[model samples]
Target chain A: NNYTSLIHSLIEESQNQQEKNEQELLELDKWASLWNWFN
Target chain B: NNYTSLIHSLIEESQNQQEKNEQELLELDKWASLWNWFN
Candidate 1:
């Protein structure tokens, strides 16, 4: 249930403005890395 | 399994729609009703 737990934490983190921004940036970085790997 | 059944119907309905607009509207209506019921 780690995926579910991670999603729950993500949802909770999104409720805080600062945490949400940081989380989004981190997510973007993760996806960017993923895109680079795919290419 | 009612929830799973409902989701299956929804997915089928969504796939059957050539234009997604009608299905989106129905989904919105369903969610709105759900929100009202929850409140």
Candidate 2:
């Protein structure tokens, strides 16, 4: 039924959110490096 | 350094995101039930 497709879509979206979160962490690592350099 | 705390914060946020995803899944289950009832 429609539920299967919807469940799959939600799974995909959750993965995307996880990837975005990982991207933010990568950027934060850069910022942390800068903080380390100066302090 | 500040990075440690930042890392902790990110971990917490990730957990929160996981919880949110589970919540969505729960809601979706309800939707799936409704779809099943009529179709």
Candidate 3:
């Protein structure tokens, strides 16, 4: 639940601040970094 | 719908991959980097 809360907050924060296209690309780079960092 | 789905998926993937502590900081870093890169 806490993890979900954190994730929801993150998405909310991202949405509240970023424009759609930029948010998409930003999320892409983020996921890429995370994937690389974890795997 | 697809773009929103894509965004959701990216967020899901990032959440599944990242550690909580680093995730927030990483997202912040990402937003900052993106703001600089795109602006």
Scoring each candidate complex against the real one, what DockQ results? Answer: 0.03, 0.33, 0.03
- In terms of lDDT, the poorest run of 10 residues in model 1 chain B is B14-23
Task: State every prediction's TM-score relative to the real structure.
Answer: 0.30, 0.60, 0.26
> Clashing pairs in model 1?
none
Best by DockQ: 2
Q: Quality of candidate 3's docking, in CAPRI categories? A: incorrect
The residue-by-residue lDDT of candidate 2 on B1-39, one tens digit each, is 788578768867886887788688868878888879897
Candidate 2 colliding pairs: none
As a TM-score, model 3 comes out at 0.26
| Range of the 10 consecutive residues with the lowest summed lDDT in candidate 2 chain B | B3-12
Report the error of model 3 at residue A4, Å.
Answer: 27
DockQ, candidate 3, comes to 0.03
**Total residue pair clashes for candidate 3:** 0
Q: List candidate 2 stretches off by more than 4 Å.
A: B23-27, B30-39
- Tell me which of candidates 1 and 3 scores higher on TM-score: 1
Per-residue lDDT over B1-39 for candidate 1, one digit per residue giving the tens place of the 0 to 100 score? 244455446545544542354445445556656666764
Using TM-score as the measure, which candidate wins? 2
